[model samples]
Target chain A: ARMDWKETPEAHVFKADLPGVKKEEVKVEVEDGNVLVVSGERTKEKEDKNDKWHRVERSSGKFVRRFRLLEDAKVEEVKAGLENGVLTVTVPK
Target chain B: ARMDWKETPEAHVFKADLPGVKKEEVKVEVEDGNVLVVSGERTKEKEDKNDKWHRVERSSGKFVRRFRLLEDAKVEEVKAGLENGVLTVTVPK
Candidate 1:
């Protein structure tokens, strides 16, 4: 449930840590103007699957985050990459 | 803090989800013959620098988890792997 946003000279980089979450399950879109919308759901294996859990603390649910773009950011050439369950989105200026 | 422990016929599987944690920072060792010790530190970049944080929920600190071995489990052949901040340690039987 943590996020990192970095403002560089050329672009804005947004990173989200999604442990145990698959890349295909995450979605990002640039709305009208400079608004950025990120949405995703974390799924857990069925509890009835005969696996015994001594302890449980991971959260699994649908989450969505929205960000208003800076005045000078260009949303046209945005790019994103997901690795090891971390999603990084870059919006160029 | 959440952990999962599953028992199989051949081995026991222990999993801990640690988001935004580097692999080299995690350590695993067998102590007192059957006790499994997993230790790590989650250090965040200095917030006083420059990046602006709007909303954050990630926890950063030193953590240690210990598990006692079962009667038939073999500690010498244990194996562990860390990826996407998740650590999985296998205790063979």
Candidate 2:
């Protein structure tokens, strides 16, 4: 699991890398509208015996990531999006 | 760009984490079917000005990774696939 958090003037963005995961597998929630909570589950549906993943840098399974939004942020205005393999949660400050 | 190389008896695989890159952007090549070469380009296509990227961990730009497959690998049989932001290249041995 890998991630990054950045502060933009209007919002704080949380990013998580979850490759090969379907849209239904990821969940993003906010706590007290200030804490950005992100979680996701990955199931190994591909049991190709011929496909040997020799290098396992990319991880699988469950991951929970939390970040405290900007000090003066509003939770209701926050928005999150998952694109390609990156999950982004934006909290407005 | 980060990567790992591993040998799995039957084949060698290469993996790269490229978030937000479309499938057509990555190219995988093999020299004499023994050397694997990977190259890709990433652009800041997202120009959301309000989106403050205060934290920027994901990398954008160009990267080329080369690997010498196991001594006895065939190039023509190699297969490459890009999924959910992960690019995997496999060379048969």
Candidate 3:
């Protein structure tokens, strides 16, 4: 839901919390300048043949977050992962 | 190849360096107490047509790293990611 950036002695780390998201649904890319974009969708679970939901508080939608990195960050070496609903991007210096 | 842990005000973060690994190949589980097991393999890249290897400094193999979290850490909320080549795990309180 939110994104934050922190600088380490060796690199810059981007931390994001994206709950109930599938790994394949997430996407990451570097835009113009040092801005990095991370976006993804969380799909609703599949229903059974005769099942219907009356109230669904957990809906499905897309989310996008961007980060502006330092000039010394290595954009090409950026790495990302989605695990247990969190997405992290690491940019080395 | 190496794992380290840091204490934060609200959580404990576990970071590991695992270069050149696929998302599907990595696995994580809580072994016992606060100890967690993170393991994965970096499979050799597919061979190209009419291409021969001369010197391959980048090797492909399985790597395992473990972390022992604090008692107050929330293990169920642990999140992980593999971006670029690093694996980061976050355990919130």
- Top lDDT prediction, candidate number: 1
Q: What is the per-residue lDDT of model 1 for residues B21-77, given as tens digits with 9 covering 90 to 100? A: 777778899888778998888786664445555455556789899889876677778
Better of 2 and 3 by DockQ: 2
Q: Rank the candidates by TM-score, best first.
A: 1, 2, 3
lDDT score of residue A29 within candidate 2: 83
lDDT (Cα atoms) of all candidates against the true structure: 0.75, 0.71, 0.64
Give the least accurate 10-residue stretch of model 3 chain B, judged by summed lDDT: B47-56
Minimum summed lDDT over a 10-residue window in model 1 chain A is located at A45-54
Residue-wise C-alpha lDDT for candidate 2, range A5-76, written one tens digit per residue: 776666666777777677798888877756778888866445455555544555568888777775677777
| Best of the two (2, 3) by TM-score | 2
lDDT of candidate 2 over B28-77, digit per residue (tens): 87677566788889766565656545566666788887776657466567
Docking class of 3: incorrect
Tens digit of per-residue lDDT, candidate 3, span A24-82: 88898888868889987856546344432222334357888776777766889999976
User: Which regions of candidate 2 fall more than 4 Å away from where they truly are?
Assistant: A4-11, A42-54, A70-74, B1-13, B49-51, B71-77, B90-93
DockQ leaderboard ranking: 1, 2, 3
Off by over 4 Å in 1: A46-48, B47-51
